[PDB]
Structures are given as C-alpha cells and as structure tokens.
Design a binder for this molecule. Sequence first.
Ligand SMILES: Cc1cc2nc3c(=O)[nH]c(=O)nc-3n(C[C@H](O)[C@H](O)[C@H](O)COP(=O)(O)OP(=O)(O)OC[C@H]3O[C@@H](n4cnc5c(N)ncnc54)[C@H](O)[C@@H]3O)c2cc1C
Ligand code: HEM
Length: 572
Amino acid sequence: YYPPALTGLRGSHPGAFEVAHQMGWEKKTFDVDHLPIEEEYDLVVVGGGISGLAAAWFYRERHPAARILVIENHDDFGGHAKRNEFQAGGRTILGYGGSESLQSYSEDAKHLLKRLGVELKRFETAFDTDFYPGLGLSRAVFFDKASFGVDKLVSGDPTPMVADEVPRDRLNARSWRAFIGDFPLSREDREALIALYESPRDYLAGKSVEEKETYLAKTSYRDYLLKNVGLSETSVKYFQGRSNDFSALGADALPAADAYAAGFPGFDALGLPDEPYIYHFPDGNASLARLMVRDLIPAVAPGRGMEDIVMARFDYSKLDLAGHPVRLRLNSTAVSVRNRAGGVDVGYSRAGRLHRVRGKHCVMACYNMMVPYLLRDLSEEQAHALSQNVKFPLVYTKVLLRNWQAWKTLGIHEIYAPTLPYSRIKLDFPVDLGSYRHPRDPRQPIGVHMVYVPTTPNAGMDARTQARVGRSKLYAMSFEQLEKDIRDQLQAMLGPAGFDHRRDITGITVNRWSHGYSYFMNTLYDDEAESEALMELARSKVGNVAIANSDAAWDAYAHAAIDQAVRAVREL
Ligand SMILES: Cc1cc2nc3c(=O)[nH]c(=O)nc-3n(C[C@H](O)[C@H](O)[C@H](O)COP(=O)(O)OP(=O)(O)OC[C@H]3O[C@@H](n4cnc5c(N)ncnc54)[C@H](O)[C@@H]3O)c2cc1C
Ligand code: HEM
C-alpha cells in the first residue's frame, strides 16, 4: 500500500470526495451521536495537510504526552503536498503533485524547519541553477493555430516572472524587438507590443498617483491593456494565461495593480512607486509533509533530516497503530464535530461506515468551506463566512518522457502557452538532494511538469464564479479527456522536432486539485475591509474547536498553513 507510486488520475482522486459531496451537494447528514465512543485522544485534527500535520506537531511540542489523531480523506497524507513517483531505466524519478516550493518566515515556521532538519541554504548547492541555462536553453511561448492562425514556438523569452529559478543574467533571452518580431501576429500588433517595452507612455496622464493606484486596483489587466494602453483584442490574447499558475485566473481577473506588482509590462511610465525560487525538494513540499509524518510517527520510516527523507521508504501500515500516541488515519471523511463535556466528539466515515471518537481539543485543518457541514455549533454568521472561502481549481500533471532530445533541439526548458489548456509546460526543476540525482542526459528519461487551469476567460465572471465553474468543468472530465489534452498539446508543441507522444510518453500522472488555492481578496470584486472581517469571523474559535488550514488566512502558501496551525494550537 504505497500511494506515491500510483499514476493516472491522482490529486483529489476517486474515493476522496464522495462522502464530502453527499454533505455539500445533497445535504445528507451523518450523525454519530447514537454510536459509542470508540477512541479517545487529547487532540483530534480534521485534515492531513501541512496545516493539520503542523497542528499535531506544535500541539505535541506543547503537550509532549498528547494522544493525537489526524483524520484525512485522501488515500495519502499531505493534502496539496503529495509525492509522485515514476520508474524508468531502473531508477526512481520524483515529482511534486501540488504545492511546489518554499520561499526564504514567522519564528514558529523557522522553529519547525530547524527542528525537522531543514536548512534552507542547503538548496544553494542542491538546486542545479545553471543546468538548463548552461545547455543554452531558454523559455518559449507556444502560439496555437486556432488563436493566432498558425502554430509557432518562439524561444528566447525575456519575460521576468514572480517565482523565478533562473538567474536573470542567465535567461538566454533575445531582445524584445527580436523576440516579439517572431510572434504570429500582424505587423501592427507586433509594433504595438514592441512599443509597450521600447516606448512606455503615461496611459493614465492627468491622474495623480493616488487616483492611478485606485483605478489600477479596480481595473483588470486585460481591460487596462485594452482601454488604456490601446492594444488590440488579438494582442492582449498573448497575456491571457500568463497569470494562470500563480494566481489561478487569467488576465481578465488579474487586477492591474497586481499585474504591476508581478512585473507585467505597461506601467514603467505611469509614475507609480526577485529572490531565487530554488527551495525545491525533488517531490516539492511533500517533503515537508513527509518530514513531519516521520517526526510524528517514527515507525513509518527510518532516518532524520532533510537529506535522507528524499528517498526514505514510508511504511503506511505504521501510520495508524494504537498505543503509538500519534495516529494518522487515511481514506476517512470527517462528518461531525461537536462540543460536549469539555471535549469534542468527532464522527468520520471510512469505507462507508461511521465511527465516533473523542478528543479534548479539535483543530479543523480541512478546507474552510467544508467546516460548516461538520461543526455543529457554528452560528449562521460564522458558517456563512466559512463558505465564502471559494477555492480555485488547478491541475498539476506529471509526464514521464523517454528522452528530451526534442527539447534540446528546440532549445527550450519551459514553454508558456497563452491560450491552451496547459499554460505552463517545463522540464522539471533539476535538484540533487540526499541520494537522488536529477536526470541529466537528454537521451534518458526526465519528468515534465505542466499546469492546467480551467478558467472561463472574458465572460464577465467574478473570481468565485470562475472558480466554481472551473470545478464544474473538471467534474465533467473523464481521465480519458484529460489524457487527450495532455497528448494533443505535447504533440503540437514538440511534434515538429521529431516528438511522438505515443512512442515518447512513458508515464502520466494527473493531480486534480478541484479545491486548490485558498480564496484570496481580489480588488476587482471584493471590498478589503469586508473581506478581512469575513476572514476573521470565519476562523473564530468555537468552544474547544479551533480552525486552521491555509484557507483561514486567505493565503495559499505552506507558510500560511503552518502559521494558521500555530495560531489554532495556541488558542487551545
Ligand atoms: C497546485 C498547487 C500548487 C501549490 N504550490 C505552492 C507553492 O509552490 N508554495 C506554497 O507555499 N504553497 C503552494 N500551494 C499552496 C498549498 O495549498 C499549501 O502550500 C499547502 O499545501 C496547503 O496545506 P493545508 O493543510 O492548508 O491544506 P490542504 O493541503 O488542502 O490540506 C487539507 C486537507 O483536508 C482534507 N479534508 C477536506 N475535507 C475533509 C474532511 N471532511 N475530513 C477529512 N479531511 C478533509 C482535504 O482533502 C485536504 O487533504 C500550492 C497549492 C496548489 C493547489
Ligand atoms: C476532484 C474531485 C472534485 C471535484 C471534481 C469537485 C467538484 C465540485 C463542484 C463542481 C462543486 C460545486 C462548486 C462549489 O461550490 O465550489 C464542489 C463543491 C464542494 N466540494 Fe468538491 N470537488 C471535488 C473534490 C472535493 C473534495 C476532495 C472535497 C472535500 C474533502 C470536496 C468538498 C466539497 C464541498 C463541501 C463542496 C460544497 C461547497 C459549499 O457548499 O460551500 N470536494 N465541488
């Protein structure tokens, strides 16, 4: 029993969500008040992600002898932080199923990393930052026939990005004029894009700095480019999907002020008033989850420290052993949380069967939108606040390739596709850590990472609706349909250099994050003071039940997941 080696439809896989959807969609309720209490703990944690795991860890630090149960509905621990594995040519090749890297922090977060043996500066040498640039490789843009008239792959992209692992002097980029000159657009559209970089103008002339800023927070980037810079509808399509990965929506939902702060073009002349993105374990932040699980339940794997975790062998049969004071219980959907007698009764469903356990304390570390269906003591106001945290769907696909000669031939290590389902397609980060060595030889297998976000661009939707509609679209897609999109797009982009998707793909893992990033405050649709009041109301302590998850901070980062766990534990 070893989830990390599974391929196919992963992420929120079949079996993880059905009981939750009976509560959320059908309003079925699962009461356990008539069942005997089976087990008793000091702390019961709902949700086995980084935040739930952190809550167990900090609670135990404060209560060394604590008995702790973690209830988790996926078939593996870690939530968004999942380890993916491939086998090729005798060796394991690692990938990240979701939460990707760390930055370089509260004292509590520092204290957690140190106690786990995570030295952040180790990545200065573990991340092979000059590997792809040293091979002469650059980032490219892929234009699709349907949108631009013809398929064209344009390399040498100098566009600077928010979470950039490439040293800026090492982009192997061309000039804006040279690079844009190759765009499959009319001469007029190319001149207009080029002038965007070569000859910025004050497109908001007349307005003071304060009025410009107000305007930019209430105007989408797309509209700013359309109405103020004057780019054509065909030009702006170049920008449509650039924000898909880091914000979970396209340029039509990106506030222009947020585009400015992300380094997007168009603002240099308005008169308005970086760190290497290399903190990446070979399986992403699943290492952080695995680190905590081993530290919490030492029978699961041997060793200690950030080096040997990478290839440590986890025995899942040791996760949920009684007597062991910390127990992690997978494939288990919590359905009921109720204060009683200075304790908390927790009900969960497992293989269709209901169970009841007790803790003195409870931390709700699951999706915040799930909490109203579980916590029976919520006022209507707080339940409603919780339900306003509408999470964004994302899909992170791992693809194993026989070789990557087609990438070498095309001179690329990463593609941006403005309008296709997958907007980000890249050879995986080259990272050597512990006994794991990143693939090096283009004749040999390598992992590809690629990001698909089911946005509905230019429809007039607010962000919450784009999120919910995105989930409807994902729900309506079989694994077969997802696989076709992968193979169709890889074939169209790499086909010209000899790629053959049927011959050259030797593994596919689709991590379906239907409930991906936490909601965050979007100044195009939300009022800041109202949004903050909703946030603080939603995470309010309820008796002996505290609420965590990154959701509780409206902030989709592993460090928010840790700090919300810390706050929750201290309240208890
Ligand atoms: C695709 C993607 C990429 C990301 N990349 C990064 C990155 O590079 N850096 C970064 O800092 N952050 C990143 N994140 C943010 C990520 O959400 C956090 O880093 C962290 O993984 C979230 O931890 P969590 O514990 O808050 O939530 P989760 O990981 O979502 O854990 C909550 C868990 O509770 C479970 N649960 C829900 N309902 C129930 C129930 N009724 N009973 C039991 N369990 C339940 C859920 O299924 C889930 O497994 C990324 C997120 C996504 C989706
Ligand atoms: C990949 C699998 C999934 C798909 C395709 C999916 C799809 C959807 C859709 C279309 C909705 C309605 C739109 C919305 O309100 O956001 C929804 C809502 C919801 N989902 Fe999921 N979902 C999945 C997984 C999960 C998981 C893993 C959980 C919890 C563990 C979950 C719990 C819920 C709940 C509770 C709601 C109700 C939201 C509310 O009432 O506020 N779903 N999902």
